[PDB]
Amino acid sequence: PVIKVRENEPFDVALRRFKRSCEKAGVLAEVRRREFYEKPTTERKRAKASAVKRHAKKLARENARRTRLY
Amino acid sequence: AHIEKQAGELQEKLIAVNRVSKTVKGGRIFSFTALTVVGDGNGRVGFGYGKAREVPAAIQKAMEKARRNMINVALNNGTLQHPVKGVHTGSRVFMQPASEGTGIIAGGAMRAVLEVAGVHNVLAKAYGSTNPINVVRATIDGLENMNSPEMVAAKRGKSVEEILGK
Amino acid sequence: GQKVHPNGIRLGIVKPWNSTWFANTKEFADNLDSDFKVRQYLTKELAKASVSRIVIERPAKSIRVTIHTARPGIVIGKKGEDVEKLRKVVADIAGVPAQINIAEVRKPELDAKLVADSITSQLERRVMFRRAMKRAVQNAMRLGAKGIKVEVSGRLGGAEIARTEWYREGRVPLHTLRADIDYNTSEAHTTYGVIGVKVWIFKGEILGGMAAVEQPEKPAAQPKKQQRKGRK
Amino acid sequence: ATVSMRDMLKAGVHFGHQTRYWNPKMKPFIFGARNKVHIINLEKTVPMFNEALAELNKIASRKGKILFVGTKRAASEAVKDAALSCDQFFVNHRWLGGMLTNWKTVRQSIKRLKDLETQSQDGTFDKLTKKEALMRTRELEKLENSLGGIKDMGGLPDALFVIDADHEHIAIKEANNLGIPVFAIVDTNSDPDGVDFVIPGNDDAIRAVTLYLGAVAATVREGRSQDLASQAEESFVEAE
RNA sequence: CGGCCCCCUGGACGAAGACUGACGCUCAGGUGCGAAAGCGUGGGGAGCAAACAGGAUUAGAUACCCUGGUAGUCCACGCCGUAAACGAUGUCGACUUGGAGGUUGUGCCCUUGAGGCGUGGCUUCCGGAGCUAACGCGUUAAGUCGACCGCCUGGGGAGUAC
């Protein structure tokens, strides 16, 4: 999992951000772990789930203008 | 206090008293809690669960909440004709119009909570939890819509009120 | 149950000592034990009066009692026989003849031992204590001061457990060195044993009832103060 | 008064924004978005604007006291101006929670302020350490900034003057429990619900928010002014 | 229910033209139909694994944990259809402020940005009336209701006994 997609300009440290798009996730991540059939649909596919903390933050920005904390 | 009826002097019917404390990190809570009903014989919603450090202060706090922001309820002393199918937090009541010639039997304090409410003749046995705190709540949810008509034009009665909104 | 005793660090500045005399080391124990005996046996006689403090003082060839009271007339009794009997026994205990004065009475309703006799009476007399702690506090704050603490112990209601209760209201400093501030711990008996109230009351952060002397050394005494600087 | 159609229009052609979110109970006064920009509906607003302004002229002779609440970084200079003078009270260094319900208390701490201000100027609290005296000067500055436009208020107000409700809901809640009529200016994310009169608006555009409050403020303040004049006019007619 | 195709083919979502005209709701009994392993014969078998064995723990059961290691897991047809069987939210239908996300029939637009409005579609965020013990639900209800059916009536002992 140095990830086959080549890093822009080659260097001794791999640019792990610039490389992954959908590798390792779900396929080679749960190594030495119990495989489930249908749990992965709700267990791993968490892109909506992780957006909510960013939204919460983008809401509280506005309120800090109205409170005069900002 | 604020919107309350032409009560004159206080009902000071204290229904329960407690003291509650966690003692987990630094001793007890010294405060008491109090449950008090304040009416006037003529129909009120006045009911207060409040709390403060000592028993005199507990009652007066509780009574202050029995007396602020409490609607007038416009019943004929101990008779009521238009009660409500009372629900408050699983504690269920179903009063209905009824004579004052037949009396009221009710255990404990219940004729006394009911007496200052004016709903003592219409009351019929409660259901759900018979926990002393919520069992007495007849006079709150059970009085929100009402009348006690004395008018001869009761049989026109919604009509007269309807043609005025036109 | 914490703290070095709250009035005890205050004893060197703006709080007076409870006794003031000096004996040159070797006779200091003999004077301290007599100063105790006058405290113990004299107060036994005035049992029926009400009193806030006892202050014992020893000039040359004399012992002066100061006593601080709920009123000026209370210790004197009918036609001064009573106050002579007090001086009689102060003269019998002490290696000298005796003087007694009653002080000027100032804040006797807010004073350390007289406010605590008023509060101890409720517990002594086995009243319900449903409203007591609030009526004690109501009257201290109605007659004066700036803050009060009361702590009551001795198994309230007759209990077979340790049982304490307390009340603080206003301002009550604890680690302050300046002004007099009044504390008393009462001891008293009832049917079931000994009861006791610990009472801090706080009158003011500046109090002039004991204050430093009028002058420094440098302006005081003789007008021509400079030395010859030898020349015997 | 005739004012009410010119103020609402001048202000309102900003059409707001607040992205496409908004609040459903405000929906009647909202036209549908024009390519991910929010648009006001003004025509349903013309009944609302006139009604509030006619009732404000009327209470002018009955009231002693207005209170300007709902301050923000954008609303403060409009909160200072609308009061114009001290029969009309305002906060711009924050509203604090409970300023009306515990008015008993607020009035005790104001008495601590106008006392300890005349004291600081004689020099009286500067004693002990300089730290103990500067640390008092700094809490006195904060108290002073917070209270500076409400220090003479003799009682609970006759009305509540709200310039946005979005974040200041407790002040309104209590004012209704004291039975005080609230005169509201709401943004799109605000609800018109649960207060007595609305000027439906939006919180963006500095030119809109200034105009809503000036329309609402002018009617009651110069209304009051006219109540005062009529007393003058009664003696004077005989020699006129 | 997830590789891609072909053959047979269900069910739901739209839309115009058009037709019938209560032909409707619910469903005991009922017949059909399995997540999972269980499982009979045939086919298939690569790894992994209950047990089993031994180490390791002392922490006890060969368990846990690690290494060896088998039935099993896998397909086809077939037998009693089990559970936390799911939005533990019955069915279908009528009524109740809405905006917007995901994304799609389709009316309109330079489709000014998984964009905007008209009107259907499942799917979801927010919150109002109502509803809750409380979290929560809220136009896809756990609201207002409709009929009809299904099931529950203190714990332990019993999902066993009969």
Buried b (16+ CB within 10 A) or exposed e, D88-120: bbbbbbebeeebbbebeebeeebeebeebeeeb
Q: From D212, D225, D103, D210, select the one nearest D157 (Cα to Cα).
A: D103
Query: What pairing do the DSSP bridges indicate for beta strands C193-202 and C182-185?
Result: antiparallel
Report the C-alpha gap between D237 and D240 in whole angstroms.
5
**Cβ atoms of C129 and C166 closer than 8 Å:** no
Amino acid at C116: A
Describe the strand order of the beta sheet including C51-57 as a list of residue ranges. C19-20, C51-57, C63-69, C98-102
Tokens of B82: 């238009």
Instruction: Decide: B73 and B91 in contact? Cβ < 8 Å.
Output: no
Calpha distance C85→C82 (Å, rounded): 5
Nearest alpha carbon to residue B80 among B142, B145, B147, B126: B147
Residue C166 lies in a domain: yes
- Beta bridge partner(s), residue B3: none
Q: C202 and C135 share a domain?
A: yes
d(CA D36, CA D23): 16
- Angle formed by the axes of helices D206-236 and D4-12, to 10°? 160
Long-range contacts of C124-130 (CB under 8 A, 24+ apart): C124/C188, C124/C190, C124/C195, C126/C158, C126/C190, C126/C191, C129/C156, C129/C157, C129/C165, C130/B54, C130/B55, C130/B56
Q: Give the number of domains in chain C.
A: 2
Domain end residue (candidates: C54, C81, C106) = C106
Q: Are residues C153 and C72 in the same domain?
A: no
* C81 and C136 together in one domain: no
D29 CB less than 7 Å from any atom of strand E: no
Do D199 and D216 contact (CB within 8 A), yes or no? yes
Asked if C89 and C119 sit in the same domain, the reply is: no
Residues D229, D213: contact at Cβ < 8 Å? no
The residue written with tokens 């001869």 in the block is B152
Q: Provide the experimental method for this PDB entry.
A: cryo-EM
Identify whether the C-beta of residue D208 lies closer than 8 Å to the C-beta of residue D49: no
* Residue C94 included in any domain: yes
Q: Are B142 and B95 in contact (CB under 8 A)?
A: yes
Q: Is residue C5 part of a domain?
A: no
Provide the CA A32 to C1' E50 distance, Å, integer.
Answer: 19
Q: Write down the H helix ranges in chain B.
A: 55-65, 110-117, 138-141, 157-162
Query: D164 at the A interface (CB within 8 A)?
Result: yes
- Both C91 and C123 in one domain: the answer is no
Q: What are the residues facing C100 on neighbouring strands? A: C65
A61 CA to E106 C1' in angstroms comes to: 40
> To which H or E segment does residue A65 belong?
helix A47-67
Residue A26 phi/psi, 5° resolution?
Answer: 90, -30
Q: Count Cβ atoms below 10 Å from residue C19 Cβ, excluding itself.
A: 17
Cβ of residue D22 lies below 7 Å from strand E: yes
Domain assignment present for residue C8? The answer is no
**Contact D178/B2, CB-based, under 8 Å?**
yes
Domain shared by C23 and C64, yes or no? yes
Do C34 and C121 have their domain in common? no
Q: Do chains A and C touch (3 or more CB pairs under 8 A)?
A: no
C28 shares its domain with C93: yes
Cα separation of D24 and D190, whole Å?
10
3-class secondary structure per residue, chain D = CCCHHHHHHHHHCCCCCCCCCCCHHHHHHEEEEECCEEEECCHHHHHHHHHHHHHHHHHCCCCCCEEEECCCCCCHHHHHHHHCCCCEEECCCCCCCCCCCCHHHHHHHHHHHHHHHHHHHHCCCCCCCHHHHHHHHHHHHHHHHHHCCCCCCCCCCCEEEECCCCCCHHHHHHHHHCCCCEEEEECCCCCCCCCCEEEECCCCCHHHHHHHHHHHHHHHHHHHHHHHHHHHHHHHCCCC
Q: DSSP character for C15?
A: S
The tokens for C49 are 């009066």
Cβ atoms of D213 and D199 closer than 8 Å: no
- Distance from C-alpha of C145 to C-alpha of C15, rounded to nearest angstrom: 17
**Of D225, D164, D148, D229, whose CA–CA distance to D199 is shortest?**
D164
Q: How many CB atoms lie within 10 A of CB B160?
A: 11
Instruction: Name chain A contacts of D164, Cβ cutoff 8 Å.
Output: 66
Say if the Cβ atoms of D94 and A68 lie within 8 Å: yes
**Distance between CA atoms of residues D209 and D182, nearest Å:** 18
Beta bridge partners of C65: C56, C100
Same domain, C171 and C190: yes
Domain boundary among C91, C106, C121: C106
| D11 token code pair | 């202000």
Structure tokens at D77: 């200079």
- By the 10 Å C-beta count (0-12 exposed, 13-18 middle, 19+ buried), C141 is classed as middle
Two tokens at D199?
């000027």
Tell me if C180 is assigned to some domain.
Answer: yes
Range of the domain at C50: 16-106
Determine the residue among B29, B30, B54 to mutate to test chain C binding: the one whose Cβ has the most chain C Cβ atoms within 10 Å.
B54
Residues sharing a CB contact under 8 Å with residue C158, sequence separation 6 or more, in sequence order: C126, C192
Closest CA to B15 of B31, B38, B43: B38
Closest nt to residue D32, judged CA to C1': E117
First to last CA, chain D: 28
List Cβ neighbours of D17 (8 Å cut-off, separation of 6 or more).
D37, D38, D202, D204
C90 and C126, same structural domain? no
| Secondary structure (3-state) at B147 | coil
Give Dmax over CA atoms of chain B in angstroms. 67
